[PDB]
Amino acid sequence: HIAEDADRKYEEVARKLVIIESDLERAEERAELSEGKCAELEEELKTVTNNLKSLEAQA
Amino acid sequence: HIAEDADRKYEEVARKLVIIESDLERAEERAELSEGKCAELEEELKTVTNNLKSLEAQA
Amino acid sequence: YTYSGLFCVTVNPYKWLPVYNAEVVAAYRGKKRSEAPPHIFSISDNAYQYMLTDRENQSILITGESGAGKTVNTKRVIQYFASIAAGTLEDQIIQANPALEAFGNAKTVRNDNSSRFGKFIRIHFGATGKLASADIETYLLEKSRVIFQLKAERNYHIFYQILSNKKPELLDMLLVTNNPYDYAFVSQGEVSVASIDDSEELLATDSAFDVLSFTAEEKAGVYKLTGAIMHYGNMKFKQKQREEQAEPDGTEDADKSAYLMGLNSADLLKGLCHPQVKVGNEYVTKGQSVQQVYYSIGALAKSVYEKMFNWMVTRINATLETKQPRQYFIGVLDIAGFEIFDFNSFEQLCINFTNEKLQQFFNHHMFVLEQEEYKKEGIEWEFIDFGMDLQACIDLIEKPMGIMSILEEECMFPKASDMTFKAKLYDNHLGKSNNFQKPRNVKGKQEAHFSLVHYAGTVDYNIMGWLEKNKDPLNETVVGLYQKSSLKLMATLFSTKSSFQTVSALHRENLNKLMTNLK
Amino acid sequence: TTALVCDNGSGLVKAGFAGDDAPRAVFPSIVGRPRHQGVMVGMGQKDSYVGDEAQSKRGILTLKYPIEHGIITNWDDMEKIWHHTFYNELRVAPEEHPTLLTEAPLNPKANREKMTQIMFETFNVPAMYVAIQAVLSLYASGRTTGIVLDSGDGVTHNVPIYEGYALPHAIMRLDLAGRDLTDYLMKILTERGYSFVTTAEREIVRDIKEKLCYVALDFENEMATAASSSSLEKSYELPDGQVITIGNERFRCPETLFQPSFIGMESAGIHETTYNSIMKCDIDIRKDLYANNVLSGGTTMYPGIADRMQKEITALAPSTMKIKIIAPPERKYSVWIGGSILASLSTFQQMWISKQEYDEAGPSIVHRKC
């Protein structure tokens, strides 16, 4: 009884582990994609800062 | 014998589960940190672009 | 040879004389100073006698800023001590010397081979007066040079010795070119003097490591550490776009040094830009500006260099020691002396402070001697202490409102500069002390900022740059990284409920320890 | 001899030695007393628990803060907390150490009088001193000019400094801080079904606040976004299982700092009181104040608070000034760091209030001179 109980509940534990691992891989993709997009965004911001400072000097 | 072998394999898989959950929460907190900052600096980019346009009018 | 009250003045003759060899002149055994001619052999023998009749260690303080005369006298006194109380200690001592020559000597404005530390050679003696092993002990070392050198000077010889491209094996291992003007930690003043070669001295140091107990690893590791100390000099950081934060731009020297010392590159950059701290029971990232990162880099370089130096001296003590448990020893103290240059700065101030301390020590000794002699002849005559009450007032530099405490305060205070430092100095001392005086700055000569009335005259100091030179913030995150390095020499160095560190404070503590030993 | 730095605060005691980089002891400023019967004979039940021992036993205790809004309203409890701090956390003898206490600006004088009397009599400190939290925060920021916004657990205050000169007529003090946000969150969580009424449950809600709450850059469209999708919902697990999920509460709780009308206060947001404190200063220094807003304290640790602050002040100030919000990553211990720096200065060792001065002048010396 106790052995099969542990068996079933901990196989379900392994199922929740599959879920958590899937979502962890998803979150790694999310993090890497977001940091790449935001490195692009920081390129945009540094460029536009250069633009504004140069152009306001001219102004 | 079956019962204790099962219990030990299970507990090891679960102690890997716990670290998978920790790395998942770390990944998602980093991703949300990122995206939130990225939209805040997106608003910053909007401001600096509006200033760029007003400055073009000034030029 | 001459006697001066209690000193023993020797002049370099520059002409070979048998006045020391052979032992025909060494007949001073048993003889006293007051009867025999005035030779340093008489003093060595007197120290021997005093050790045998008093069981109290003896000390020989030989003047060291003189280029010659001191070294030959040290050789002659160790030879004499071997002779009287007889692979020898003299051979052994002079074998591993190239290590110290390359590590603790640098091109000075008024020299070209300058002892930039304190060498306290202990020749140990048996229970009865039999020669035992002899260990070397080093004291306060001018570590500020490892990063900053004045114009028309350069740091310790070993850097240019290595960078003379003599062993292309090394300059191939340390990912390092040969042009000295590419490394800011060495290209500050002048890269080389014409009064010495670097290749043959590199060979001498190699042979020193060989005669030393060093293996192949205990030599490649040292070369790697010196290469890393050079690679630190040209790491670059920039304020993050639009907020404040120091971040790295380009990691070339980063990867170089990371591979050399045996660390990770991303981990090192993160620990340099994001140092962690323990708040009660938790860790929190601390922010770092660019100047803070640079200060930390310099502090790391200085700490590494001093640790390596001390470890090498321990290795020399090990390879040069094998003897029965002995009791007593004689102290041979080599150290720089007082300085009065045309442009005095922080280092000169520290050196003059040490010499003020030593001179007060001598004055106390001579005072108690004269007072004893007066109580001996029944001559009733008492006077204010001739030992300390002369310089104890020229010890502003240590009392907790003098120059050093003010400099530390200014190192801590926000937005402090050299002008504010000068203002504070004036408000606390100008007019309120007699030894503190305003310099008489005449147009046509270098500008001073204040003048101290030392025992050896009134010296004029120029405080420009003391703030950056006194800061010493150690980055404990990077030290923890060091403690895990693969290069076993680095881990041995850094084996052993912080941002307040200053060069002056460590210097004062070291000087206190040295005086405690001598007293 | 080294000195002690004892930034008290209304939610956390941070103590340590002058000259360190971070406080040596950080524990809650709380005193717990047993609530239930007690049946095990020989268990050795204590009368009261302090610090974080009262935090792990909080299931059976009723917790009380002896400091309400920066003011010490229970002096026996405060004495217990100080005794604990000295003897069990730092493990020193107060007779051998000057002590640097700290206090918020613009609070009653009896507070400081009682502080110094307590120290000198029931602890026999050789000397002591009561600083102002904002000045120490500026010390720790490495500046001599700026308008510092300190926001801890009890009180939020602005102090504008210029060249080391304070403008005491422009100091503005506000009385909503971490604790009022905790109470507002306890009240807002009931509209999802969760009911926290005990003091221990107040601690649980405080932790939920410290883990899941953030400041929205634009409140209205953030509200509309949380209404439309459900990507803003996180989950938290109480210390008995029983996970809870919160949605727009995450940013509705700290938004109270910018609209104090959510808790029925009439004051203005912290951005507006900062701007008013600036506009109360001499027209020549306010350009340099605009660029040195120094954030300090725990309540300024929400994600996105610096960006919202800069957006709001930029919208208020003229369109030519450069608004710079300076938010260090360790800004939660800025007051203690600055206090250690201050107590380490050589030129400060004459500013202490020696025991002899107290014996001559009574407790009234603390503000009459120092």
Ligand SMILES: Nc1ncnc2c1ncn2[C@@H]1O[C@H](COP(=O)(O)OP(=O)(O)O)[C@@H](O)[C@H]1O
């Ligand atoms: N990471 C965090 N995010 C949001 N709020 C926090 C955070 N950490 C602490 N707080 C808030 O800060 C308060 C404690 O801050 P602190 O500066 O220690 O107060 P005090 O200065 O009065 O001791 C707590 O009430 C808590 O609500």
